[PDB]
RNA sequence: AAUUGAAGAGUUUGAUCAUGGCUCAGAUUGAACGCUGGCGGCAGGCCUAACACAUGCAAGUCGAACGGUAACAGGAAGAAGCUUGCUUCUUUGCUGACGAGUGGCGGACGGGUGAGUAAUGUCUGGGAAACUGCCUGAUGGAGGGGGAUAACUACUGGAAACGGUAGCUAAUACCGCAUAACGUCGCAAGACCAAAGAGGGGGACCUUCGGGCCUCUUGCCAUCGGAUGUGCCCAGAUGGGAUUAGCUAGUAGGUGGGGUAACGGCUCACCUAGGCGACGAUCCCUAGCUGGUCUGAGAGGAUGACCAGCCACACUGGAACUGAGACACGGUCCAGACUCCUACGGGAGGCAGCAGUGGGGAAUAUUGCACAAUGGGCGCAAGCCUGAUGCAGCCAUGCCGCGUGUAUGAAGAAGGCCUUCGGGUUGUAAAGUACUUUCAGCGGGGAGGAAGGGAGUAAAGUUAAUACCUUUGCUCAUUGACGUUACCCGCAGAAGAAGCACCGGCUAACUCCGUGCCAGCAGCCGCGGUAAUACGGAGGGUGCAAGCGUUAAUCGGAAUUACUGGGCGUAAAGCGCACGCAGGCGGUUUGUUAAGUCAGAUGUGAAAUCCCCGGGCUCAACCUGGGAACUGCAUCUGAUACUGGCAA
RNA sequence: GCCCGGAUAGCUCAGUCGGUAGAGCAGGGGAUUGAAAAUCCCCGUGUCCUUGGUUCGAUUCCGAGUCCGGGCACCA
């Protein structure tokens, strides 16, 4: 649902990344708390967010759950994320919405393995803005360590080629705001001014025939399924014919009803993170990896050509070169294709550190075009990255 | 709905010359007929009962261009008539529209008497039609419509009809486009040469 | 249900209330006539009898008795006392 | 129990799939056939002919 | 009560009332005393196309039939004088 | 004019004739699945879980019944800025209207579903022991008073729901009294029983200036009718099982009391001891019934989706109330199971209404538009409401129509396939060339579904009246969801539109290659063991065509349940034999009756559907007028041969 | 989406507790037959489900992925 949408301000997506227990979702709820006395209607609790039991009783965010706030600026939809390795699917989707992440780094532990990880893995999906939000401050006041872990976390955003020095960098206890410590509450609202300002308003392809890649299905208790999704380009109005192309045969549907968080929304449009009802469509029909495009548009593929950069072991990648039918995971906008490598002539073994290319065959027929940047992981870290250079 | 393929080797399987491709030529001759439907054409069949009173049916639809489930209602409703289950299934295929714009002779074939009436080119009483399948009542006259009147097919078509049999139960202008259907075709004017008995052995079973 | 005509829910209620008043002073007249039959008094029962006739017929032009059930009291309550009488 | 048709399958120990009658009357005591093309059970692969049966989609070029 | 009404029969976006005699607690298309005439409000510029038995009506206002008045609209298109 | 209609084949055998099953050729379907897929028209669309249900909506209406006016807009007294009448603006039910409330009507219709029901139901034909709002006919009345209550106030409980206490007021709300009759009770005399007022206009008169008085419309009461609907009773018909033979104790009937609108063991007390049953009771399983649908030459067989009639149910079980009518889908009360809210005291809900969700399933649709039309409720009407209905959406689910082009064209091309390697075949097919443009696409025109209703006006009734009202004409502005409609014209271009199964026999159409009892095919007989017209591919051909096959189902063929229309020596089938109850059948003569039979007539056999001759959508499907038919049933009037009863 | 198991020739199963893979039934091959059966004379006939690391070496050690089975969560 009820409440139409009010469009008036700028669509940003931005969410937490970084470490296990340095305060992401924490940040998260703290984040809608302090907003709330500069907007009205919010104020997500931690409970909130973190409302499934295994997350109740084990204590650790492994949904993505999405949460929404805004400055008098722009409209922020915060995507939390799940930083626990054997949770990577999750984080991945999530950091592909993601338009400037807010690096979550405890000044208790510093740079850690995973935060190590999803600054790569967020590189590889081309997340741009990187805020760092050093939280746990609360705990130590040794502002030498305290520079010296400002400089440590700037030193893994350099060789990831981010911009380190020229990032900001928030201090402040994620905690303590929650309750209201106007102490540490300032510092949250100093990171929402990098939030607003080093962010800029991003470029969207409204006019192009519209395209939505699928994170997760739902079946709302009611209405029928509501798969979720980014407009990536062009929009939709309710009642637009759509059709499902993807890892399985394609489906039609229509629109039968677009909103966002819960919000009625009657016509969505490039980068908004909406929810869309489909017309009678079956929960075991549709499911993630597919994507949702205007009629004709797109068709699945499972043959085409690209490139491969494999960094150094020490950084993640390889040390060991492969031979042919080498298959890896394809992660491109939601899925994780597996495929076979076909490689080029006398290709031996691809060396870790190459920039050449191959060809790939694949298990599922998946909507593509050249052009279509992808990751490429494999054993819990990437190996290279692609783009569609041309169909095969 | 329409056959559209090959119509002359229609002839060839029937035997007869089915005047699918009369057009302006005279006679065919250039067809191979009569010794090759295919590639083992020049083989006898065994031609059982059930095989001539399937040919027998298929040669009487092929000219009219009527398809099966057109042809089996045509006969139902001669079934169900008074007079002869036969006679009367061959009165229904001669009051088609498109078989009456050949027989007047506005078109050379039954297939371009059919291009003629479906484009809107043909009137009843005053009345377009672009159903082939009408039933024309006896008694009306039909001509062309005065836009599409007399446009390069129609006048060699025209010419064509005067070296044909030009029938009894139907009269026509000629000179203004106008042809008149008086009453009900009898068995003794029409074709002849097929036979109306078989299709009823056919339909019966 | 929500309807707005849940006003014959407690208007019926404050008929069922009414009526029940108006049958119930009706059978206290009947059975004072057969108090009276039980005793044989065939001049009392006239006098109940001659009594209960106007308020057993009164209902009938208010629709609560049927006319038929009003006219069956009087028949066969005569034709009790005219036995005894 | 029942038939499975065309050359060549991918049934294993599950693998839900749909059933229609029709005896073989080469197996005594099997009156069923397992339907080609309908659920988890693939079509005949490399049919060319009679392929609405044995559930081939006819070829994209 | 029995009222003189019409019915709705014919095909889509093709009527074609039959004025029928029912009891005016049951469907247009439902049980009837009897049927008395129809109207084709489309029939064409033809031989014919309304047909009220005045006759038959007549009797049934004698008997108190409440004739609707699209079929009361009817009586007077079919003049009591022509 | 109205049944002009009836087919056979494969397979037991070395072969034949019988007997005998199995299978196929036809039609049909609420269909599902696979491959494929251009459009339109008309229909259909949860067959399974009567499973559980989020959200919205499906029954409201009248101010011409009444007290009121909380809103919105005016009228009116006054008020304040200020262009002293431009406005600001507080009072005020005084009008238009109108939340909440009282009251009247509807809510028992319309819509859905098929669980239950084997007879309490349905169908058919009769019957008497009944009631019947709205509608309408005839005959009369419609006099005079009183006591409360909601809303509304003060206070107040409760989260909410929902109240509580004491006062205020009205009525077409409620209770009397008078008055009664062809009304009820009673053999009769006699006794007893009803009611309601509002609204429009208005001369004279009358006015405590509320209004009375005249007049017209409408409603109220009484009585008997008519019509419609409903309740009840009887007879025949209405599934399978005897591996269900005895069943019943308010049970069978009687008498009296009570009860119902009405008859009745419907219900009680007493009395009699009966009642149902082999012409199938009880019990068990299954099932809504019918008009009809499919099939059939017919007789029959299967079936009961859509349309229509009747019945039954409303989460489960039960009960009663209000009312003309329910023992009530969107009412009440209680209990139960399951969900939901909670401030933990207590409450809320019932999609088998339209959509929609999850589930189940091989499988079945939009959380759309409009009340314009038809019907219904209410109302004087205007109007308001109407998920009835009218339309649109979705799906090839079915029936019907159309299109994917036409004519010409031999070097009888290339390529593919076959070959006696000559050639044949694909094939006039293609290309080339000359034309056309349906339906799609695009841009303009454009019916019909619309009848009424509103305002004004004139005349005719009415009346004291040129008034009000009513009625019949006329005039003006109009009322369409579908709807960028059907249909017509215009522009461009062969342009955007052909698959599916089969090819051993049955059964229409054949060769080559590969695989060698392997892989596989198959409706039946059967193919495959290194020369496969049967397997897989290719070429060609055949059938059908936006469909085609496969599976499931019913009937047909099957005279393979034989009444029409079969059998029993040896093929399946004469009880081992006999006596014999019920039952079935029964020589011959006369008379009589008239149950069976027959003839005639009357009533009924709902409409639709089927059939016949016509009419309208460009044809068709579809709709539709008239008729026939509905092969049946009941009563009456006659015939008397044959059967039955009766008498000799 | 999460967690937990299973996958070794054509079929049915043994096997590791890092060391260059088995058993039986079948299958293929010669003589015999029209072709087989039986009899006689011969050959594992494996991507250890896939893939990449740990190492000289991975079925056996550790991660991704595929199909399946069981339990669990999520609800614009
Ligand atoms: N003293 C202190 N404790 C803190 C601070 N921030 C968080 N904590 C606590 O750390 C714990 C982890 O919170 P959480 O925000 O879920 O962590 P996460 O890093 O998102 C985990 P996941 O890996 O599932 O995404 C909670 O107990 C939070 O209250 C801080 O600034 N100071
Ligand atoms: C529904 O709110 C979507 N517009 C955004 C979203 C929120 C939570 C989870 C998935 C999608
Ligand atoms: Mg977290
Ligand atoms: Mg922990
Ligand atoms: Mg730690
Ligand atoms: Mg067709
Ligand atoms: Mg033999
Ligand atoms: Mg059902
Ligand atoms: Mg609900
Ligand atoms: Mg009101
Ligand atoms: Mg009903
Ligand atoms: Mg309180
Ligand atoms: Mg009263
Ligand atoms: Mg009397
Ligand atoms: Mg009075
Ligand atoms: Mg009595
Ligand atoms: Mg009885
Ligand atoms: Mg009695
Ligand atoms: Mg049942
Ligand atoms: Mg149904
Ligand atoms: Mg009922
Ligand atoms: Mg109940
Ligand atoms: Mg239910
Ligand atoms: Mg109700
Ligand atoms: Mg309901
Ligand atoms: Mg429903
Ligand atoms: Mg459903
Ligand atoms: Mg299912
Ligand atoms: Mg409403
Ligand atoms: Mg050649
Ligand atoms: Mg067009
Ligand atoms: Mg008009
Ligand atoms: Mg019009
Ligand atoms: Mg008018
Ligand atoms: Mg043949
Ligand atoms: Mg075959
Ligand atoms: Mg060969
Ligand atoms: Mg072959
Ligand atoms: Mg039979
Ligand atoms: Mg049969
Ligand atoms: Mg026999
Ligand atoms: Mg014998
Ligand atoms: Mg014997
Ligand atoms: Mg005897
Ligand atoms: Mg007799
Ligand atoms: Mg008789
Ligand atoms: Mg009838
Ligand atoms: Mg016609
Ligand atoms: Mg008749
Ligand atoms: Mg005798």
């Given at each position: 649902?009820?409440?139409?949408?009010?469009?008036?301000?700028?669509?940003?997506?931005?969410?937490?990344?970084?470490?296990?227990?340095?305060?992401?979702?924490?940040?998260?709820?703290?984040?809608?708390?302090?907003?709330?006395?500069?907007?009205?209607?919010?104020?997500?609790?931690?409970?909130?967010?973190?409302?499934?039991?295994?997350?109740?009783?084990?204590?650790?965010?492994?949904?993505?759950?999405?949460?929404?706030?805004?400055?008098?600026?722009?409209?922020?939809?915060?995507?939390?994320?799940?930083?626990?390795?054997?949770?990577?699917?999750?984080?991945?989707?999530?950091?592909?919405?993601?338009?400037?992440?807010?690096?979550?780094?405890?000044?208790?532990?510093?740079?850690?393995?995973?935060?190590?990880?999803?600054?790569?893995?967020?590189?590889?999906?081309?997340?741009?803005?990187?805020?760092?939000?050093?939280?746990?401050?609360?705990?130590?006041?040794?502002?030498?360590?305290?520079?010296?872990?400002?400089m440590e976390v700037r030193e893994l955003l350099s060789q990831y080629d981010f911009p380190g020095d020229d990032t900001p960098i928030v201090r402040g206890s994620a905690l303590k705001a929650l309750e209201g410590d106007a102490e540490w509450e300032a510092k949250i609202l100093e990171l929402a001014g990098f939030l607003d300002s080093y962010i800029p308003e991003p470029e969207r392809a409204i006019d192009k025939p519209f395209l939505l890649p699928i994170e997760d299905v739902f079946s709302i208790s009611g209405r029928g399924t509501v798969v979720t999704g980014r407009v990536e380009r062009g929009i939709i109005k309710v009642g637009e014919e759509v059709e499902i192309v993807g890892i399985?045969?394609?489906?039609?549907?229509?629109?039968?009803?677009?909103?966002?968080?819960?919000?009625?929304?009657?016509?969505?449009?490039?980068?908004?993170?909406?929810?869309?009802?489909?017309?009678?469509?079956?929960?075991?029909?549709?499911?993630?990896?597919?994507?949702?495009?205007?009629?004709?548009?797109?068709?699945?593929?499972?043959?085409?050509?690209?490139?491969?950069?494999?960094?150094?072991?020490?950084?993640?990648?390889?040390?060991?070169?492969?031979?042919?039918?080498?298959?890896?995971?394809?992660?491109?906008?939601?899925?994780?294709?597996?495929?076979?490598?076909?490689?080029?002539?006398?290709?031996?073994?691809?060396?870790?550190?190459?920039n050449i290319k191959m060809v790939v065959t694949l298990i599922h027929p998946i909507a593509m075009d050249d052009g279509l940047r992808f990751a490429i992981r494999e054993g819990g870290r990437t190996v290279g990255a692609g783009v569609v250079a041309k169909v095969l | 709905a329409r056959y559209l393929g090959p119509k002359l080797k229609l002839s060839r399987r029937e035997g007869t010359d089915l005047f699918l491709k009369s057009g302006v030529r005279a006679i065919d001759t250039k067809c191979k007929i009569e010794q090759a439907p295919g590639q083992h054409g020049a083989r006898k069949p065994r031609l059982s009962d059930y095989g001539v009173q399937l040919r027998e049916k298929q040669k009487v639809r092929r000219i009219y261009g009527v398809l099966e489930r057109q042809?089996?209602?045509?006969?139902?409703?001669?079934?169900?008539?008074?007079?002869?289950?036969?006679?009367?299934?061959?009165?229904?295929?001669?009051?088609?529209?498109?078989?009456?714009?050949?027989?007047?002779?506005?078109?050379?074939?039954?297939?371009?008497?059919?291009?003629?009436?479906?484009?809107?080119?043909?009137?009843?009483?005053?009345?377009?039609?672009?159903?082939?399948?009408?039933?024309?009542?006896?008694?009306?006259?039909?001509?062309?419509?005065?836009?599409?009147?007399?446009?390069?097919?129609?006048?060699?078509?025209?010419?064509?009809?005067?070296?044909?049999?030009?029938?009894?139960?139907?009269?026509?202008?000629?000179?203004?486009?106008?042809?008149?259907?008086?009453?009900?075709?009898?068995?003794?004017?029409?074709?002849?040469?097929?036979?109306?008995?078989?299709?009823?052995?056919?339909?019966?079973? | 249900n929500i309807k707005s005509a849940k006003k014959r829910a407690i208007q019926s209620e404050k008929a069922r209330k009414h009526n029940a008043s108006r049958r119930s002073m009706m059978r206290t007249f009947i059975k004072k006539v057969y108090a009276a039959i039980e005793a044989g008094d065939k001049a009392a029962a006239q006098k109940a009898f001659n009594e209960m006739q106007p308020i057993v017929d009164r209902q009938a032009a208010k629709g609560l008795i049927h006319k038929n059930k009003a006219a069956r009291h009087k028949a066969n309550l005569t034709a009790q006392i005219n036995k005894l009488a | 129990t029942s038939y499975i048709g065309g050359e060549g399958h991918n049934l294993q120990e599950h693998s839900v799939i749909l059933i229609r009658g029709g005896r073989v009357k080469d197996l005594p005591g099997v009156r069923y056939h397992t339907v080609r093309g309908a659920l988890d059970c693939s079509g005949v692969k490399d049919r060319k002919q009679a392929r609405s049966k044995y559930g081939v989609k006819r070829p994209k070029a | 009560m029995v009222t003189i009404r019409l019915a709705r029969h014919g095909a889509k976006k093709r009527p074609f009332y039959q004025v029928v005699v029912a009891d005016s607690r049951n469907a247009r298309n439902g049980r009837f005393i009897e049927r008395v005439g129809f109207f084709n409000p489309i029939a064409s510029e033809k031989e014919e196309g309304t047909r009220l038995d005045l006759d038959r009506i007549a009797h049934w206002v004698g008997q108190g039939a409440t004739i609707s008045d699209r079929v009361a609209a009817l009586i007077k298109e079919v003049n009591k004088a022509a």
């Open positions: 649902s009820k409440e139409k949408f009010e469009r008036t301000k700028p669509h940003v997506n931005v969410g937490t990344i970084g470490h296990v227990d340095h305060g992401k979702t924490t940040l998260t709820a703290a984040i809608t708390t302090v907003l709330a006395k500069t907007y009205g209607g919010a104020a997500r609790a931690f409970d909130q967010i973190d409302n499934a039991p295994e997350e109740k009783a084990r204590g650790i965010t492994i949904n993505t759950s999405h949460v929404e706030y805004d400055t008098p600026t722009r409209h922020y939809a915060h995507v939390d994320c799940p930083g626990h390795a054997d949770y990577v699917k999750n984080m991945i989707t999530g950091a592909a919405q993601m338009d400037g992440a807010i690096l979550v780094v405890a000044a208790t532990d510093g740079p850690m393995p995973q935060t190590r990880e999803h600054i790569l893995l967020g590189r590889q999906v081309g997340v741009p803005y990187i805020i760092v939000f050093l939280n746990k401050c609360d705990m130590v006041d040794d502002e030498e360590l305290l520079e010296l872990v400002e399985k045969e394609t489906q039609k549907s229509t629109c039968t009803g677009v909103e966002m968080f819960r919000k009625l929304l009657d016509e969505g449009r490039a980068g908004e993170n909406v929810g869309v009802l489909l017309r009678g469509i079956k929960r075991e029909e549709i499911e993630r990896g597919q994507v949702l495009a205007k009629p004709g548009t797109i068709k699945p593929h499972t043959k085409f050509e690209s490139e491969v950069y494999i960094l150094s072991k020490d950084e993640g990648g390889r040390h060991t070169p492969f031979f042919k039918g080498y298959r890896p995971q394809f992660y491109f906008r939601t899925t994780d294709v597996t495929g076979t490598i076909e490689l080029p002539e006398g290709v031996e073994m691809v060396m870790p550190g190459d | 042809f089996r209602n045509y006969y139902k409703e001669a079934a169900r008539l008074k007079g002869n289950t036969g006679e009367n299934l061959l009165a229904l295929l001669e009051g088609r529209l498109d078989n009456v714009v050949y027989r007047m002779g506005f078109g050379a074939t039954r297939a371009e008497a059919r291009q003629l009436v479906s484009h809107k080119a043909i009137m009843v009483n005053g009345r377009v039609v672009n159903i082939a399948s009408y039933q024309v009542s006896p008694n009306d006259v039909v001509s062309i419509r005065e836009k599409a009147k007399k446009q390069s097919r129609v006048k060699a078509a025209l010419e064509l009809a005067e070296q044909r049999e030009k029938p009894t139960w139907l009269e026509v202008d000629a000179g203004k486009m106008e042809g008149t259907f008086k009453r009900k075709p009898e068995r003794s004017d029409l074709s002849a040469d097929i036979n109306e008995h078989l299709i009823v052995e056919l339909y019966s079973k | - | - | -």
